[PDB]
PDB file of C-alpha atoms in Angstrom:
ATOM      1  CA  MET A   1     -44.627  86.178 -18.961  1.00 15.20           C
ATOM      2  CA  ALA A   2     -45.680  89.295 -17.043  1.00 14.40           C
ATOM      3  CA  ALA A   3     -45.546  91.492 -20.108  1.00 14.46           C
ATOM      4  CA  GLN A   4     -46.730  91.035 -23.802  1.00 17.66           C
ATOM      5  CA  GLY A   5     -44.586  90.795 -26.970  1.00 17.77           C
ATOM      6  CA  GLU A   6     -42.412  88.116 -25.219  1.00 20.08           C
ATOM      7  CA  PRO A   7     -41.093  84.945 -27.011  1.00 22.11           C
ATOM      8  CA  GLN A   8     -43.249  81.616 -26.620  1.00 16.30           C
ATOM      9  CA  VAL A   9     -44.149  79.972 -23.249  1.00 16.36           C
ATOM     10  CA  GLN A  10     -43.310  76.346 -23.731  1.00 17.91           C
ATOM     11  CA  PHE A  11     -43.322  73.726 -20.568  1.00 17.09           C
ATOM     12  CA  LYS A  12     -42.500  70.261 -20.690  1.00 17.35           C
ATOM     13  CA  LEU A  13     -45.149  68.050 -19.680  1.00 18.21           C
ATOM     14  CA  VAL A  14     -44.422  64.391 -18.819  1.00 17.85           C
ATOM     15  CA  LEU A  15     -47.576  62.349 -19.028  1.00 15.41           C
ATOM     16  CA  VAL A  16     -47.041  58.929 -17.118  1.00 16.01           C
ATOM     17  CA  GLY A  17     -48.888  56.101 -15.654  1.00 19.06           C
ATOM     18  CA  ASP A  18     -49.534  52.301 -16.203  1.00 18.42           C
ATOM     19  CA  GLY A  19     -49.802  51.143 -19.882  1.00 17.10           C
ATOM     20  CA  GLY A  20     -53.372  50.794 -20.858  1.00 18.76           C
ATOM     21  CA  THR A  21     -54.474  53.979 -18.848  1.00 14.53           C
ATOM     22  CA  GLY A  22     -55.309  55.607 -21.875  1.00 15.29           C
ATOM     23  CA  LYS A  23     -52.443  58.209 -22.199  1.00 18.94           C
ATOM     24  CA  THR A  24     -51.663  57.963 -25.781  1.00 21.54           C
ATOM     25  CA  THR A  25     -55.705  58.515 -26.253  1.00 19.24           C
ATOM     26  CA  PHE A  26     -55.858  61.313 -23.787  1.00 16.72           C
ATOM     27  CA  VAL A  27     -52.959  63.176 -25.815  1.00 18.15           C
ATOM     28  CA  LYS A  28     -54.333  62.882 -28.988  1.00 13.92           C
ATOM     29  CA  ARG A  29     -57.467  64.508 -28.213  1.00 14.10           C
ATOM     30  CA  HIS A  30     -55.624  67.621 -29.525  1.00 13.93           C
ATOM     31  CA  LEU A  31     -55.809  67.886 -33.209  1.00 14.90           C
ATOM     32  CA  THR A  32     -53.156  70.156 -33.733  1.00 13.53           C
ATOM     33  CA  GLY A  33     -50.858  68.229 -31.418  1.00 10.39           C
ATOM     34  CA  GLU A  34     -51.436  65.130 -33.204  1.00 10.45           C
ATOM     35  CA  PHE A  35     -50.641  66.965 -36.445  1.00 13.34           C
ATOM     36  CA  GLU A  36     -47.173  68.369 -35.342  1.00 16.54           C
ATOM     37  CA  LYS A  37     -46.090  65.413 -33.152  1.00 14.96           C
ATOM     38  CA  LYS A  38     -42.280  64.590 -33.217  1.00 14.90           C
ATOM     39  CA  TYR A  39     -41.201  61.454 -32.662  1.00 13.85           C
ATOM     40  CA  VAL A  40     -37.611  61.346 -30.742  1.00 12.21           C
ATOM     41  CA  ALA A  41     -35.698  58.132 -31.563  1.00 11.40           C
ATOM     42  CA  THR A  42     -33.370  57.931 -28.838  1.00 10.13           C
ATOM     43  CA  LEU A  43     -35.806  58.908 -26.253  1.00 10.23           C
ATOM     44  CA  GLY A  44     -38.814  56.908 -27.779  1.00  9.48           C
ATOM     45  CA  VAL A  45     -41.135  59.557 -27.072  1.00  9.48           C
ATOM     46  CA  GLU A  46     -43.783  61.202 -29.328  1.00  8.12           C
ATOM     47  CA  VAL A  47     -43.609  64.905 -28.221  1.00  7.63           C
ATOM     48  CA  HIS A  48     -47.169  66.602 -28.933  1.00  9.81           C
ATOM     49  CA  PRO A  49     -47.221  70.448 -29.148  1.00  9.21           C
ATOM     50  CA  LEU A  50     -50.372  71.087 -27.310  1.00 10.47           C
ATOM     51  CA  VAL A  51     -51.341  74.716 -27.553  1.00  8.61           C
ATOM     52  CA  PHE A  52     -53.697  76.339 -25.244  1.00  9.12           C
ATOM     53  CA  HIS A  53     -55.047  79.737 -25.649  1.00 11.23           C
ATOM     54  CA  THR A  54     -55.312  81.871 -22.368  1.00 10.73           C
ATOM     55  CA  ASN A  55     -56.255  85.295 -21.585  1.00  9.74           C
ATOM     56  CA  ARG A  56     -52.776  86.059 -21.524  1.00  9.61           C
ATOM     57  CA  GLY A  57     -51.959  84.518 -24.680  1.00  7.65           C
ATOM     58  CA  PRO A  58     -50.847  81.098 -26.015  1.00  8.19           C
ATOM     59  CA  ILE A  59     -49.454  78.366 -23.479  1.00 11.39           C
ATOM     60  CA  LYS A  60     -47.624  75.585 -25.008  1.00 14.65           C
ATOM     61  CA  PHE A  61     -47.497  72.286 -23.379  1.00 18.06           C
ATOM     62  CA  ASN A  62     -45.093  69.698 -25.154  1.00 16.78           C
ATOM     63  CA  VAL A  63     -46.783  66.451 -24.247  1.00 17.50           C
ATOM     64  CA  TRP A  64     -44.382  63.642 -23.840  1.00 16.04           C
ATOM     65  CA  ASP A  65     -45.965  60.501 -24.297  1.00 17.70           C
ATOM     66  CA  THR A  66     -44.132  56.954 -24.244  1.00 17.85           C
ATOM     67  CA  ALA A  67     -43.876  54.606 -26.749  1.00 19.17           C
ATOM     68  CA  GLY A  68     -45.117  51.856 -24.475  1.00 18.02           C
ATOM     69  CA  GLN A  69     -41.960  51.728 -22.467  1.00 16.74           C
ATOM     70  CA  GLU A  70     -43.792  51.519 -19.232  1.00 16.71           C
ATOM     71  CA  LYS A  71     -45.432  48.000 -20.359  1.00 16.78           C
ATOM     72  CA  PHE A  72     -42.057  46.728 -19.940  1.00 16.61           C
ATOM     73  CA  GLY A  73     -40.272  48.703 -17.260  1.00 11.33           C
ATOM     74  CA  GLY A  74     -39.627  52.231 -15.824  1.00  8.77           C
ATOM     75  CA  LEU A  75     -38.931  55.334 -17.579  1.00  7.90           C
ATOM     76  CA  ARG A  76     -35.102  56.522 -17.949  1.00 12.01           C
ATOM     77  CA  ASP A  77     -33.891  59.753 -16.260  1.00 12.22           C
ATOM     78  CA  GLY A  78     -33.705  61.528 -19.880  1.00  9.84           C
ATOM     79  CA  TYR A  79     -37.580  61.228 -20.356  1.00  8.88           C
ATOM     80  CA  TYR A  80     -37.995  63.064 -16.881  1.00  9.33           C
ATOM     81  CA  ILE A  81     -35.073  65.552 -17.178  1.00  9.65           C
ATOM     82  CA  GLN A  82     -36.246  69.180 -17.251  1.00 10.81           C
ATOM     83  CA  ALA A  83     -40.225  68.252 -16.697  1.00 12.46           C
ATOM     84  CA  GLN A  84     -41.871  71.654 -15.653  1.00 16.06           C
ATOM     85  CA  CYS A  85     -45.245  69.622 -15.110  1.00 17.15           C
ATOM     86  CA  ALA A  86     -46.756  66.356 -14.929  1.00 14.20           C
ATOM     87  CA  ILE A  87     -50.003  64.419 -15.444  1.00 14.06           C
ATOM     88  CA  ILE A  88     -49.985  60.874 -13.660  1.00 13.04           C
ATOM     89  CA  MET A  89     -53.017  58.806 -15.020  1.00 18.56           C
ATOM     90  CA  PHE A  90     -54.847  55.951 -13.924  1.00 19.43           C
ATOM     91  CA  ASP A  91     -57.661  54.060 -14.852  1.00 21.06           C
ATOM     92  CA  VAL A  92     -60.659  54.141 -12.669  1.00 21.24           C
ATOM     93  CA  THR A  93     -61.955  50.729 -14.098  1.00 21.63           C
ATOM     94  CA  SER A  94     -58.349  49.212 -12.800  1.00 24.51           C
ATOM     95  CA  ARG A  95     -57.569  49.370  -9.149  1.00 22.79           C
ATOM     96  CA  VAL A  96     -53.835  48.127 -10.014  1.00 18.64           C
ATOM     97  CA  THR A  97     -53.274  51.381 -12.150  1.00 19.06           C
ATOM     98  CA  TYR A  98     -54.207  53.323  -9.169  1.00 18.47           C
ATOM     99  CA  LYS A  99     -51.904  51.316  -6.826  1.00 19.35           C
ATOM    100  CA  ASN A 100     -48.885  52.137  -8.861  1.00 17.47           C
ATOM    101  CA  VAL A 101     -49.473  55.765  -8.961  1.00 15.85           C
ATOM    102  CA  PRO A 102     -47.316  56.095  -5.880  1.00 14.04           C
ATOM    103  CA  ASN A 103     -44.652  54.289  -7.858  1.00 18.48           C
ATOM    104  CA  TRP A 104     -44.893  56.880 -10.506  1.00 17.34           C
ATOM    105  CA  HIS A 105     -44.809  59.973  -8.650  1.00 18.93           C
ATOM    106  CA  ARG A 106     -41.676  58.638  -6.499  1.00 20.07           C
ATOM    107  CA  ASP A 107     -39.833  58.322  -9.769  1.00 21.81           C
ATOM    108  CA  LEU A 108     -41.074  61.473 -11.109  1.00 21.15           C
ATOM    109  CA  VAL A 109     -40.114  63.401  -8.117  1.00 19.12           C
ATOM    110  CA  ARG A 110     -36.831  62.077  -7.915  1.00 19.76           C
ATOM    111  CA  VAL A 111     -35.798  63.700 -11.130  1.00 20.22           C
ATOM    112  CA  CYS A 112     -38.123  66.667 -10.905  1.00 19.87           C
ATOM    113  CA  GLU A 113     -38.256  68.018  -7.566  1.00 17.98           C
ATOM    114  CA  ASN A 114     -41.629  70.349  -6.643  1.00 18.65           C
ATOM    115  CA  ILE A 115     -43.012  70.259 -10.104  1.00 21.17           C
ATOM    116  CA  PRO A 116     -46.652  70.563 -10.362  1.00 23.53           C
ATOM    117  CA  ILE A 117     -48.522  67.381 -10.887  1.00 21.34           C
ATOM    118  CA  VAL A 118     -52.237  66.665 -11.597  1.00 16.45           C
ATOM    119  CA  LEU A 119     -53.387  63.074 -11.154  1.00 19.66           C
ATOM    120  CA  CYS A 120     -56.237  61.852 -13.666  1.00 18.85           C
ATOM    121  CA  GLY A 121     -58.630  59.383 -13.337  1.00 20.12           C
ATOM    122  CA  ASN A 122     -59.411  58.269 -17.017  1.00 18.55           C
ATOM    123  CA  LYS A 123     -62.449  56.143 -18.505  1.00 19.35           C
ATOM    124  CA  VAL A 124     -65.015  57.670 -16.444  1.00 21.15           C
ATOM    125  CA  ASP A 125     -66.908  57.072 -19.305  1.00 19.94           C
ATOM    126  CA  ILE A 126     -67.432  53.383 -18.456  1.00 17.96           C
ATOM    127  CA  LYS A 127     -70.271  52.591 -16.075  1.00 18.62           C
ATOM    128  CA  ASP A 128     -68.255  50.234 -13.892  1.00 20.31           C
ATOM    129  CA  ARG A 129     -66.211  52.512 -11.973  1.00 19.88           C
ATOM    130  CA  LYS A 130     -63.956  50.563  -9.365  1.00 20.53           C
ATOM    131  CA  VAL A 131     -61.801  53.583  -8.306  1.00 18.55           C
ATOM    132  CA  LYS A 132     -64.143  56.095  -6.620  1.00 18.83           C
ATOM    133  CA  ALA A 133     -63.861  59.477  -5.341  1.00 15.88           C
ATOM    134  CA  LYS A 134     -64.375  57.646  -2.028  1.00 17.89           C
ATOM    135  CA  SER A 135     -60.880  55.789  -2.596  1.00 19.22           C
ATOM    136  CA  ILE A 136     -58.597  58.529  -3.962  1.00 15.26           C
ATOM    137  CA  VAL A 137     -56.740  59.884  -1.237  1.00 14.26           C
ATOM    138  CA  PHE A 138     -53.106  59.904  -2.240  1.00 15.44           C
ATOM    139  CA  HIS A 139     -53.319  63.862  -3.806  1.00 15.25           C
ATOM    140  CA  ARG A 140     -53.701  65.112  -0.505  1.00 18.73           C
ATOM    141  CA  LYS A 141     -50.458  63.894   0.927  1.00 21.71           C
ATOM    142  CA  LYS A 142     -48.568  64.921  -2.179  1.00 23.57           C
ATOM    143  CA  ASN A 143     -50.651  68.150  -2.715  1.00 24.97           C
ATOM    144  CA  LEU A 144     -51.690  67.285  -6.430  1.00 24.19           C
ATOM    145  CA  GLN A 145     -54.995  67.983  -7.974  1.00 20.25           C
ATOM    146  CA  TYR A 146     -57.210  65.400  -8.928  1.00 19.11           C
ATOM    147  CA  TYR A 147     -59.576  65.431 -12.100  1.00 18.32           C
ATOM    148  CA  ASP A 148     -61.864  62.924 -13.300  1.00 17.85           C
ATOM    149  CA  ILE A 149     -61.243  62.523 -17.223  1.00 17.58           C
ATOM    150  CA  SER A 150     -62.468  60.648 -20.152  1.00 17.36           C
ATOM    151  CA  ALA A 151     -60.321  60.633 -23.067  1.00 20.05           C
ATOM    152  CA  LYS A 152     -62.952  59.079 -25.200  1.00 19.99           C
ATOM    153  CA  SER A 153     -65.538  61.676 -24.633  1.00 20.72           C
ATOM    154  CA  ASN A 154     -63.095  64.546 -24.260  1.00 19.16           C
ATOM    155  CA  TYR A 155     -64.684  65.032 -20.758  1.00 16.18           C
ATOM    156  CA  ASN A 156     -62.509  67.595 -18.627  1.00 18.00           C
ATOM    157  CA  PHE A 157     -59.862  67.610 -21.151  1.00 17.80           C
ATOM    158  CA  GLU A 158     -59.082  71.481 -20.342  1.00 17.79           C
ATOM    159  CA  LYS A 159     -59.023  70.932 -16.469  1.00 18.05           C
ATOM    160  CA  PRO A 160     -55.514  69.377 -15.986  1.00 14.90           C
ATOM    161  CA  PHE A 161     -53.660  71.528 -18.481  1.00 13.00           C
ATOM    162  CA  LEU A 162     -55.526  74.756 -16.808  1.00 15.64           C
ATOM    163  CA  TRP A 163     -54.677  74.129 -13.157  1.00 17.02           C
ATOM    164  CA  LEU A 164     -51.120  73.282 -14.486  1.00 15.48           C
ATOM    165  CA  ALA A 165     -50.976  76.696 -16.403  1.00 14.80           C
ATOM    166  CA  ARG A 166     -52.372  78.324 -13.574  1.00 15.45           C
ATOM    167  CA  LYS A 167     -49.803  77.069 -11.213  1.00 15.71           C
ATOM    168  CA  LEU A 168     -46.841  77.548 -13.409  1.00 15.09           C
ATOM    169  CA  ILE A 169     -47.649  80.942 -14.557  1.00 12.27           C
ATOM    170  CA  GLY A 170     -48.656  81.931 -11.146  1.00 13.73           C
ATOM    171  CA  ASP A 171     -51.767  83.806 -12.088  1.00 12.00           C
ATOM    172  CA  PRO A 172     -55.029  81.796 -10.516  1.00 14.29           C
ATOM    173  CA  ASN A 173     -56.927  84.037 -12.745  1.00 14.80           C
ATOM    174  CA  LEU A 174     -55.859  82.282 -15.907  1.00 14.72           C
ATOM    175  CA  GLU A 175     -58.501  80.976 -18.268  1.00 16.13           C
ATOM    176  CA  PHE A 176     -58.590  79.317 -21.419  1.00 18.29           C
ATOM    177  CA  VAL A 177     -60.379  81.716 -23.730  1.00 18.45           C
ATOM    178  CA  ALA A 178     -60.791  79.113 -26.578  1.00 20.15           C
ATOM    179  CA  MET A 179     -61.018  75.417 -26.529  1.00 18.00           C
ATOM    180  CA  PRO A 180     -58.677  73.976 -28.926  1.00 18.03           C
ATOM    181  CA  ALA A 181     -59.592  71.545 -31.798  1.00 18.60           C
ATOM    182  CA  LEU A 182     -60.444  68.208 -30.446  1.00 17.24           C
ATOM    183  CA  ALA A 183     -61.067  64.915 -32.050  1.00 18.09           C
ATOM    184  CA  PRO A 184     -64.983  64.357 -32.201  1.00 17.63           C
ATOM    185  CA  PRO A 185     -66.069  61.976 -28.895  1.00 16.83           C
ATOM    186  CA  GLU A 186     -65.768  58.553 -29.299  1.00 18.02           C
ATOM    187  CA  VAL A 187     -68.550  57.946 -27.087  1.00 19.45           C
ATOM    188  CA  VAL A 188     -71.097  60.465 -25.052  1.00 20.72           C
ATOM    189  CA  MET A 189     -70.186  60.892 -21.465  1.00 23.20           C
ATOM    190  CA  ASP A 190     -73.560  61.017 -19.837  1.00 26.80           C
ATOM    191  CA  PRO A 191     -74.491  64.594 -18.202  1.00 26.17           C
ATOM    192  CA  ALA A 192     -75.979  62.956 -15.253  1.00 27.19           C
ATOM    193  CA  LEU A 193     -72.978  60.762 -14.672  1.00 24.76           C
ATOM    194  CA  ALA A 194     -70.841  63.306 -14.885  1.00 21.78           C
ATOM    195  CA  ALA A 195     -72.906  65.532 -12.176  1.00 23.23           C
ATOM    196  CA  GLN A 196     -72.599  62.743  -9.916  1.00 23.14           C
ATOM    197  CA  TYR A 197     -68.849  61.963 -10.045  1.00 24.39           C
ATOM    198  CA  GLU A 198     -68.132  65.572  -9.589  1.00 23.77           C
ATOM    199  CA  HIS A 199     -70.547  65.742  -6.688  1.00 22.92           C
ATOM    200  CA  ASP A 200     -69.095  62.706  -5.083  1.00 26.05           C
ATOM    201  CA  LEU A 201     -65.437  64.344  -5.514  1.00 29.38           C
ATOM    202  CA  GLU A 202     -67.028  67.500  -3.641  1.00 26.26           C
ATOM    203  CA  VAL A 203     -68.720  65.845  -0.810  1.00 22.85           C
ATOM    204  CA  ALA A 204     -65.750  64.395   0.424  1.00 21.58           C
ATOM    205  CA  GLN A 205     -63.291  67.086  -0.704  1.00 19.19           C
ATOM    206  CA  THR A 206     -64.615  68.864   2.145  1.00 22.58           C
ATOM    207  CA  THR A 207     -63.111  66.147   4.147  1.00 20.47           C
ATOM    208  CA  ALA A 208     -65.934  63.706   4.194  1.00 22.34           C
ATOM    209  CA  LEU A 209     -64.685  60.151   4.378  1.00 21.45           C
ATOM    210  CA  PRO A 210     -64.110  59.680   0.757  1.00 19.89           C
ATOM    211  CA  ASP A 211     -60.482  59.912  -0.064  1.00 18.95           C
ATOM    212  CA  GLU A 212     -59.922  62.848  -2.985  1.00 18.07           C
ATOM    213  CA  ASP A 213     -62.320  64.183  -0.940  1.00 17.01           C
ATOM    214  CA  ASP A 214     -60.156  63.941   2.142  1.00 18.89           C
ATOM    215  CA  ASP A 215     -57.312  65.334  -0.461  1.00 22.46           C
ATOM    216  CA  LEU A 216     -59.031  68.805  -0.897  1.00 23.07           C
TER     217      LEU A 216
END
């Protein structure tokens, strides 16, 4: 990756979390990824090639999205194998989804040790947020980075991918030069709400009592 003219850098991204989190909606935000999606019958996985353009050139994250297998049970070893990075998604309106994040993390780490993982709390668009910055403590212990996301509004779509890219490449200076074509926001995430949520994360990030915050 250090030199130019090298063949395309692709990473296998495993997207896991409880059914109903909004994993499918999240992946589908990237239009090109949707258009180029491939369904692997044996696995029962939809692989979406998400191309992100960075300062160093294109980085492709082959996002493996489940076919809803998570609803009836765990995911097979084949799904997890050779994962370079992962995003574990929970729903901020459902406490249970957050509670099951340790289980997903454990299964993921068993197959792939020391891979960069971002935990994302989706559906921050919904006003009654149940899992707040105050209670998100899982990341500290596991050295995972946390991002508030809203699939519906394309809020912070770039951030998990960017952090993963930086860690994988090993360059903290990596920036996404252009934003990929994204499906138009279903709902608009209110700027005031976004600001408040980010502020909450930061306040406790500095080890204030809030948990995501204790995490940082």
